[PDB]
Design a protein around this motif. Structure first.
Motif, PDB file in Angstrom:
ATOM      1  N   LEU A 208       0.823  -1.197   0.000  1.00  0.00           N
ATOM      2  CA  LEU A 208       0.000   0.000   0.000  1.00  0.00           C
ATOM      3  C   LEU A 208       0.861   1.252   0.000  1.00  0.00           C
ATOM      4  CD1 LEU A 208      -2.757  -0.744   2.647  1.00  0.00           C
ATOM      5  CD2 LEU A 208      -3.136  -0.474   0.219  1.00  0.00           C
ATOM      6  N   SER A 209       0.402   2.260  -0.729  1.00  0.00           N
ATOM      7  CA  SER A 209       0.954   3.601  -0.667  1.00  0.00           C
ATOM      8  C   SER A 209      -0.144   4.544  -0.203  1.00  0.00           C
ATOM      9  CB  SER A 209       1.502   4.047  -2.026  1.00  0.00           C
ATOM     10  OG  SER A 209       2.585   3.232  -2.433  1.00  0.00           O
ATOM     11  N   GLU A 210       0.250   5.652   0.409  1.00  0.00           N
ATOM     12  CA  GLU A 210      -0.701   6.631   0.911  1.00  0.00           C
ATOM     13  C   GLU A 210      -0.688   7.855   0.010  1.00  0.00           C
ATOM     14  OE1 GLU A 210      -0.023   7.911   4.887  1.00  0.00           O
ATOM     15  OE2 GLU A 210      -1.901   9.039   5.016  1.00  0.00           O
ATOM     16  N   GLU A 211      -1.862   8.229  -0.487  1.00  0.00           N
ATOM     17  CA  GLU A 211      -2.039   9.441  -1.272  1.00  0.00           C
ATOM     18  C   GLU A 211      -3.089  10.298  -0.590  1.00  0.00           C
ATOM     19  OE1 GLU A 211      -3.213   8.775  -5.287  1.00  0.00           O
ATOM     20  OE2 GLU A 211      -3.137  10.896  -5.850  1.00  0.00           O
ATOM     21  N   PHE A 212      -2.813  11.589  -0.464  1.00  0.00           N
ATOM     22  CA  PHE A 212      -3.732  12.516   0.178  1.00  0.00           C
ATOM     23  C   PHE A 212      -4.388  13.394  -0.878  1.00  0.00           C
ATOM     24  CE2 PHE A 212      -4.750  16.540   2.348  1.00  0.00           C
ATOM     25  CZ  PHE A 212      -5.611  16.054   3.311  1.00  0.00           C
ATOM     26  N   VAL A 213      -5.713  13.487  -0.821  1.00  0.00           N
ATOM     27  CA  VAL A 213      -6.486  14.373  -1.678  1.00  0.00           C
ATOM     28  C   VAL A 213      -7.269  15.321  -0.783  1.00  0.00           C
ATOM     29  CG1 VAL A 213      -6.623  12.700  -3.548  1.00  0.00           C
ATOM     30  CG2 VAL A 213      -8.431  12.775  -1.821  1.00  0.00           C
TER      31      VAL A 213
ATOM     32  N   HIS B 113     -15.445  10.820  -6.087  1.00  0.00           N
ATOM     33  CA  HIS B 113     -14.541   9.683  -6.005  1.00  0.00           C
ATOM     34  C   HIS B 113     -14.344   8.982  -7.346  1.00  0.00           C
ATOM     35  CE1 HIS B 113     -14.256   9.950  -1.649  1.00  0.00           C
ATOM     36  NE2 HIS B 113     -15.568  10.084  -1.601  1.00  0.00           N
TER      37      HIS B 113
ATOM     38  N   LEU C 132      -3.719   4.071  -0.898  1.00  0.00           N
ATOM     39  CA  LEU C 132      -4.734   4.310   0.120  1.00  0.00           C
ATOM     40  C   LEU C 132      -5.001   5.807   0.201  1.00  0.00           C
ATOM     41  CD1 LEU C 132      -6.557   3.275   2.368  1.00  0.00           C
ATOM     42  CD2 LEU C 132      -4.576   3.237   3.843  1.00  0.00           C
ATOM     43  N   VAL C 133      -6.117   6.237  -0.374  1.00  0.00           N
ATOM     44  CA  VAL C 133      -6.524   7.634  -0.375  1.00  0.00           C
ATOM     45  C   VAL C 133      -7.541   7.817   0.743  1.00  0.00           C
ATOM     46  CG1 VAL C 133      -7.631   9.459  -1.669  1.00  0.00           C
ATOM     47  CG2 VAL C 133      -6.056   7.914  -2.809  1.00  0.00           C
ATOM     48  N   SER C 134      -7.139   8.469   1.827  1.00  0.00           N
ATOM     49  CA  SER C 134      -8.019   8.626   2.976  1.00  0.00           C
ATOM     50  C   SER C 134      -8.059  10.085   3.394  1.00  0.00           C
ATOM     51  CB  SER C 134      -7.561   7.750   4.144  1.00  0.00           C
ATOM     52  OG  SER C 134      -8.407   7.914   5.265  1.00  0.00           O
TER      53      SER C 134
ATOM     54  N   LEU D 219     -10.487   5.417  -0.406  1.00  0.00           N
ATOM     55  CA  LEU D 219     -10.265   4.815  -1.709  1.00  0.00           C
ATOM     56  C   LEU D 219      -9.061   3.886  -1.664  1.00  0.00           C
ATOM     57  CD1 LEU D 219     -10.676   7.966  -3.990  1.00  0.00           C
ATOM     58  CD2 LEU D 219     -12.280   6.104  -3.729  1.00  0.00           C
TER      59      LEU D 219
END
Lengths: 362, 362, 362
Positions: free
Chosen positions: A346-351, B277, C309-311, C326
């Motif tokens: 898993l990678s973490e992406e922030f929106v 989304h 992991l889009v949180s 996501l």
């Protein structure tokens, strides 16, 4: 079982014997001790109570399956309990019982350590037999060799025989019940260019099944309208409303090849069940319209005592990626293919939830 | 809760009180001790930390359901914790506090045994409340009394009320949401020989549902093409694309009897959700095309505080083969039929993977 | 891993070092002790064996996923093990090793308390990492952003990243494999009043898919009849029966948009698999007729190392009602919506099984 029950009884009795042999065989020679002894007696009492309650909760139950080979971890646990108890008895005999140990605090602490070790063995038994397979390590494709009914499952580190029992526990409510009533390229080309008989036969069969299903729905609606909840017992009422639906039920069971699954007696019992529990005609027909799994039927169609574990690898070794094994009955077989659940990165992406801005065209 | 929280607080404070009362009330009269005392203090510190962390992890959470009768095992656990703490206090008072125990090593070991016993009670609580029902012992057929939506489950040794709560936790995401908008043999023979009105009405309904579904798919594809990701917020964009699909959505919700489930406000919220989304038209329509389970909808349709457990047997006794019980709401009911998972007898058969040899004909 | 393995090794070696340093560095200065020492040695032996067996069972396994942030509870457990071991070493050094503790019973009891504390830390690790999420607290709606394939799950108290890994472990066998090949109100009204092209195209596509499915069923039945179980290997037999079905298989894979999933090599391998395991034509076609989940296919289509992991919330905080996040791949995304499982209030109602009495009309 007998050996296991004997080991359990001896393990529970061993602390009490350790605590009672000095005060009985040598009380005058025994050295008196203060309140630490009695505090440890109370701790032993409550820890033996905890041990007995946990053993009842998890391990005072009948074996759920007859495995083809030895239960490896439960055999290891029996061996561990036995070695623990026997070694404690050996030491107790040779250095406390034979030497007539005057220090009773030492004997009490030895019994306390025994009870702690038995609670820790109970914990280890839980870890080995229940917790090692919580984390899903593998995915199993289980397919019936006859009709291809397939389900995928996640399973932890279990041996192939324990995995087999697990898959059997899943089978009787997951798959539908087994209904047995349901140059070369040139030949293939000649067949493909022929009348698609199977297509039209399948369409006709589905059409007549829908017709018999409609007749059955109407018949069961009328049948259940032929009685009121409010004298007449539920069995008599089921027998009185079965007449207005017996023909449609029989004809639908014949068109869907479900004759041997549902006898008149079982249908009457299920009518009585439904009309007793305020179940509508559709809650009645849910049992008969669909194929339904194996446990839904009579116990003579389960034949749980007739499973054969065909494995290329020895069944005491746990699963690994690629292990295929068969669970064979007299008629069909469950092909189980193992695939290790892949490593996830898993990678973490922030929106920004405010950063969503849209425009008109396309 | 209040009694349970008080018992937990007193159990955590009891070792500390045991360790602090002698050094405070009688320090000069107390006999000094070596390093074993301080080693046991460190062990008590880390074991109390372990106890607090485990209690937080499992038991510092709100009760998930209001059972009709007492939680039998949790009541037994509260009684066990209470008896343990009260008996330790009784002994401590009468043989350490009253006698002003000079030996402080004994008091420290008593507190150590208390902390060990509390960790063992925590382990027993885990075994009783979490682990006794891991091994699947029974298979439950859960059927709605109205439309016959049925699922089978495997459950361990739980009481009938805990099984009821378990089945309720499964219901809100397993079954579709309850939509309420969806001589005698001679009469049956006369009906069966009549026009199969239900068959053609069902075919016509399925055809018009497919037509409205196609209209809705086209409308939602066009609607989502009416905006671009890139000024306009996702809420404004949902409101701007809802106009080009409101009629088709409403007509499909009417033909499938889904009017009260989906308000214009909820559909706008879900449009905003999807277009936020990156969800395609089909990922939008997955909520509306199918019936969907209960938790998917508004919270006023859950009515989780209105379940009634109708059981012929007392609900504190665990499951056994044949236990039938109802989970009744104002409208429908969940009939739960229990069947013990059958005893499996596996046999081992070995086949040589090289021994597979085939021939031409048939 | 390296730090964790080092901590585990040091934790297992610490009791043995505690028990060996006095008898080696100062044996004459050491005070001799009776049988309690040896009883505690035996208890330490069996409890270290229990600790090693439990650590193997649960914690001697490779990390199953690469989380985006730190594993909060496992980091807490490493910190706890480290603080326990380091504090025991500090005390041992400063009050036993430096002072050259003559009382060896105290050192042995200190090592016993260490081993008890390590078994309790193992228990706490089980409670934190395995048991805190057994009780289902939340229901997760997981939907692919492209085709809307949705499943609901029950999950306990896990952090959002652990929940993400859990949902990924579920995805590769639950959802079908991702197949990418599959004024304004006035405009909507004009569209709705046009030819329902999508309806008839969908009906035609379903009809031709059923036709190709029928052709494929007939072709595979003939193909499997072209060989007998009984010289020829299963691979040669698969290659010999693939000719009579290659065209129908290819045409069905084209009409259902399944070309890249099934190569000729994979179909030959699966033919060999089936005809090796007595799988009928339908047990062969179960792999090809339906879409099937992701793990069923080749490993190059899993791409498990490419999840994002889009949180909106930080992913180390556990779930709560309303958390949406996501799980994005290169093509689709898994929208996960959280809803707390509602509080249930069961009531008990008793009905007499003899009180069911029915009457004739309606």
């Amino acid at each position: 079982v007998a050996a296991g029950a004997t080991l359990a009884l001896l393990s529970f009795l061993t602390p009490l014997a350790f605590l009672l042999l000095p005060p009985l065989l040598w009380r005058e020679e025994l050295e008196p001790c203060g309140t630490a002894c009695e505090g440890l007696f109370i701790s032993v009492a409550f820890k033996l109570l905890i041990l007995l309650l946990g053993s009842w909760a998890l391990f005072f139950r009948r074996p759920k399956a007859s495995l083809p080979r030895v239960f490896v971890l439960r055999a290891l646990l029996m061996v561990l309990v036995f070695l623990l108890v026997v070694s404690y008895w050996l030491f107790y005999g040779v250095r406390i019982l034979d030497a007539r140990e005057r220090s009773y605090q030492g004997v009490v602490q030895f019994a306390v350590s025994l009870v702690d070790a038995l609670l820790f063995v109970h914990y280890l038994a839980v870890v080995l037999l229940e917790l090692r397979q919580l984390q899903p390590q593998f995915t199993l494709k289980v397919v019936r060799s006859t009709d291809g009914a397939s389900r995928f499952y996640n399973v932890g580190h279990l041996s192939i025989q324990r995995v087999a029992v697990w898959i059997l526990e899943k089978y009787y409510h997951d798959f539908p019940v087994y209904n047995p009533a349901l140059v070369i390229a040139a030949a293939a080309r000649r067949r493909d260019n022929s009348h698609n008989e199977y297509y039209y036969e399948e369409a006709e069969h589905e059409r007549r099944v829908r017709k018999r299903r409609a007749r059955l729905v109407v018949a069961v609606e009328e049948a259940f309208t032929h009685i009121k909840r409010l004298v007449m017992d539920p069995r008599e009422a089921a027998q009185a409303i079965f007449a207005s639906m017996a023909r449609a039920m029989q004809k639908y069971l014949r068109t869907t090849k479900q004759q041997p699954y549902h006898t008149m007696e079982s249908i009457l019992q299920h009518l009585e069940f439904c009309i007793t529990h305020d179940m509508t005609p559709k809650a009645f027909l849910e049992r008969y319209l669909a194929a339904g799994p194996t446990i839904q039927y009579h116990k003579e169609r389960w034949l749980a005592k007739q499973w054969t574990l065909v494995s290329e690898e020895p069944v005491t070794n746990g699963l690994k990626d690629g292990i295929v094994f068969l669970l064979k009955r007299q008629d069909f077989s469950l092909v189980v293919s193992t695939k290790k659940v892949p490593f996830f990165k898993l990678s973490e992406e922030f929106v920004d939830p405010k950063s969503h801005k849209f425009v008109m065209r396309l």
